[model samples]
Target: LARVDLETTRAIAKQMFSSGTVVEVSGCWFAAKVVEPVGEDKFLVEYRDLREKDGIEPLKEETDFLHIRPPPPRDEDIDFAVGDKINAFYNDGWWVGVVIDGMKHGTVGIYFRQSQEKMRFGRQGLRLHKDWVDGTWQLPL
Candidate 1:
């Protein structure tokens, strides 16, 4: 039997999201691969989908701890509200956006800041945006 200390368990987060692990980096493309941790609270991630949108290529980007979040539920049941922050699955991966109009239709309109596009997803590819900070999930509100 082994006795695990609190620091051992608590500090496991740094090791959990290791290289090749998939996590969400906010304001960038959704669900990027962890390439390698550089230093501090920042790590470099490989992007499959472009957050810039408008037909762009994937690349590696550096982000910090607060921007990196644990994997989110995929296509989960969601209830959206106007002004609520959201991640819209537009083409390939989840995208950063905000709910501007909650219409009576099956889908709500989302405003993507990067592309400046207002659109709706009928298939309901959407999820509430969350941030990982200090080992806790923080709502964008």
Candidate 2:
């Protein structure tokens, strides 16, 4: 496997858990969850359906081999406003963030709800947050 750094691995795990979506690992896609560091740059990943009849299992993967799917595109005419909750593809999943700015020149600024980090990406990079329940955005799983 390709070499990876500890920091990047942690970020991958964080994104994977936060998004709760299928992630690419070891050349295949699987519904992934619960990333844990087993070594310096290796992670123990809990996945569902890695193979025929395979139940949830934890497997090791290198950080460099992990990939996150990007969110689908939005209509060009759609508009966003400040304080809107949004999801953006990052690291290995879509992360919840607040819209700090509206679309401008194909990019929007966001502040990650969990990490408190800010990021900017093209409009294709964001989606209106959808997992709201009980009148609030669903907390990360």
Candidate 3:
């Protein structure tokens, strides 16, 4: 298995995005919500205090509420069907933070939705990093 720090992972993800590839991030992430869309293809993906504010990037950073669209027309790639063993870093929503591919990714699935403000702690979600691989997505046993 491969392991990388948070910044490195973020770099990887950014690269993928620049290359027009939708990536699945699974690392020291959080389960925040997207209450607003900043631009045509960008939104403010927020999460609670995943870690104490540290460093220029801090332990956690805000990412785009990205979604996987199906191959063209059908666009049934957002469902996040069962058995999606993807690399998940931040796990906030029921089906938000992680990447969904193959059978798991369906079209028209609600990628980001406004969460009904609820307060809870210790319920750690997933994480998002640039250096991630599907092979290491399994829950740490």
**Top candidate by lDDT:** 1
**Model 1: which ten-residue window has the lowest total lDDT?**
1-10
Residue 96 miss distance in model 2 (angstroms): 0.5
- Candidate 2's displacement at residue 121, Å, is 1.3
Distance from true position, residue 103, model 3, in Å?
26
- Overall lDDT per candidate, in order of appearance: 0.70, 0.52, 0.31
**How well does candidate 3 score on lDDT at residue 10?**
44
Which runs of model 3 end up more than 4 angstroms from their true locations?
1-29, 52-62, 65-141
lDDT of 2 by residue, 23-125 (tens): 4343123335435544533445554434223443444344432342222334556477788866776754466678897777889988885886887878876
Candidate 1, residue 48: Cα displacement in angstroms equals 3.4
TM-score of each: 0.63, 0.43, 0.24
Q: After aligning candidate 2 to the native by TM-score, how far in Å is the CA of 63 from where it should be?
A: 20
Q: Candidates 1 and 2: which is better by lDDT?
A: 1
